[PDB]
Design a protein around this motif. Structure first.
Motif, short mmCIF file in Angstrom:
data_model
loop_
_atom_site.label_atom_id
_atom_site.label_comp_id
_atom_site.label_asym_id
_atom_site.label_seq_id
_atom_site.Cartn_x
_atom_site.Cartn_y
_atom_site.Cartn_z
N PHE B 21 0.37 -8.53 4.14
CA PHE B 21 0.55 -7.12 3.80
C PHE B 21 -0.53 -6.58 2.85
N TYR B 22 -0.76 -7.26 1.73
CA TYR B 22 -1.67 -6.70 0.74
C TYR B 22 -3.15 -6.78 1.16
N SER B 23 -3.53 -7.77 1.96
CA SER B 23 -4.91 -7.77 2.45
C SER B 23 -5.13 -6.62 3.45
N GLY B 27 -6.08 -3.65 1.08
CA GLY B 27 -7.48 -4.01 1.25
C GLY B 27 -7.95 -5.16 0.37
N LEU B 28 -7.02 -6.01 -0.07
CA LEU B 28 -7.41 -7.16 -0.88
C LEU B 28 -8.01 -8.28 -0.02
N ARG B 29 -8.89 -9.08 -0.61
CA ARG B 29 -9.28 -10.32 0.03
C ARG B 29 -8.02 -11.17 0.16
N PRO B 30 -7.91 -11.94 1.24
CA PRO B 30 -6.75 -12.82 1.42
C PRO B 30 -6.40 -13.71 0.20
N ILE B 31 -7.38 -14.35 -0.44
CA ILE B 31 -7.05 -15.14 -1.61
C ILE B 31 -6.46 -14.26 -2.72
N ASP B 32 -7.03 -13.07 -2.92
CA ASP B 32 -6.52 -12.16 -3.94
C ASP B 32 -5.12 -11.68 -3.55
N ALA B 33 -4.90 -11.45 -2.26
CA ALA B 33 -3.57 -11.06 -1.79
C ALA B 33 -2.51 -12.13 -2.05
N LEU B 34 -2.82 -13.39 -1.78
CA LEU B 34 -1.94 -14.51 -2.10
C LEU B 34 -1.65 -14.62 -3.60
N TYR B 35 -2.72 -14.65 -4.36
CA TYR B 35 -2.62 -14.67 -5.81
C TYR B 35 -1.73 -13.52 -6.32
N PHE B 36 -1.97 -12.31 -5.83
CA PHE B 36 -1.16 -11.17 -6.28
C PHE B 36 0.31 -11.34 -5.89
N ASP B 54 1.13 4.50 -1.58
CA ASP B 54 2.59 4.64 -1.60
C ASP B 54 3.25 3.60 -0.68
N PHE B 55 2.60 3.29 0.44
CA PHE B 55 3.09 2.23 1.31
C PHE B 55 3.16 0.91 0.51
N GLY B 56 2.11 0.66 -0.25
CA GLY B 56 2.04 -0.57 -1.05
C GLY B 56 3.11 -0.59 -2.13
N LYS B 57 3.37 0.56 -2.72
CA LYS B 57 4.38 0.61 -3.79
C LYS B 57 5.77 0.41 -3.23
N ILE B 58 6.05 1.00 -2.06
CA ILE B 58 7.38 0.85 -1.48
C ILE B 58 7.62 -0.59 -1.01
#
Ligand SMILES: [Ba+2]
Ligand SMILES: [Ba+2]
Ligand SMILES: [Ba+2]
Ligand code: NA
Lengths: 93, 93, 93, 93
Positions: B21-23, B27-36, B54-58
């Motif tokens: 979802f977050y990558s 638009g995060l890098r996959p490693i950053d998305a996992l870490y987050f 807003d999609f990300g916040k929900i």
């Protein structure tokens, strides 16, 4: 079931109060106010939003003490009385 | 053992969903998305990454409510059913 | 007593490993590395320090999963087996 | 009742010590010092305030370890011995 239902409602009302408070006093958009209330009461606390007014800081102190217990109860019974059986259902041969 | 194994898998799938979802949406890098995802669901929440859409916040609101219970269950059984015996093993004369 | 003692040691070693890791890989001063390790494993997570390298992010993921359970056990037995009697001692007429 | 009362007092004294420490050593306004102490000990940790001095960082390490257990005990008995009956009172036909 009836337990989960009451905890759901109580958690909703708590998040509504935070949404209303932070959109008014701190001037957040309602979605941002909701998001901030959740990030606060779950203790995640990114700090992308945080109160800038003394009214906001005092409310936040009280909001945390009253709301954390309720939110984590809900998270707990959600996991226990809704998530735990459903995962076992997917298991039994 | 079988308990720890199911909790491991469930936690992995949860972290995979957040990584995806977050990558994509944020638009995060996959490693950053996992870490987050991890920093979020453990409630550490540094805020070096946080959703800007807003999609990300929900999604984050829902992701926290569904995922915290599972993650801490895993952390709990990992400590109890894997960490606790191993430390006693190092103890007994 | 013997319980609290083992948890103390285990927590110390955990914080030493974080101090060493973050001062080396992330280039923090040792005191800042210790402080960051504590702020991380207690889930406070201010974000005044956070890992900037992928090595740091991956270690942090693992460090959180292994360390949170141990740290909160220590916090728990410290409160229960050291803080709780001492406060009662101050009470009894 | 008597339990909740002692936990209230103990939590108050803890927050007073943090208010005094951070307003003096870190130069925060007293309200900001209180707010920061609460955001710290509940693990929310926004990071809008965080210690900038080594004295502040060392105190914060100790403050977290001693205070988290007490604060969450209070949050727990507040929810259990004050919040839980009151919500049932609103329920019974
Ligand atoms: Ba946090
Ligand atoms: Ba933060
Ligand atoms: Ba932050
Ligand atoms: Na937390």
């Amino acid at each position: 079931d009836k337990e989960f239902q009451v905890l759901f409602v109580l958690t909703i009302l708590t998040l509504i109060s935070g949404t209303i408070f932070y959109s008014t006093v701190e001037g957040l958009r309602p979605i941002d106010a909701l998001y901030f209330s959740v990030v606060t009461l779950t203790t995640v606390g990114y700090g992308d939003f945080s109160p800038q007014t003394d009214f906001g800081k005092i409310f936040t102190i009280l909001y945390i003490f009253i709301g954390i217990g309720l939110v984590f109860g809900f998270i707990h019974k959600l996991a226990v009385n809704v998530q735990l059986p459903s995962i076992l259902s997917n298991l039994v041969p």
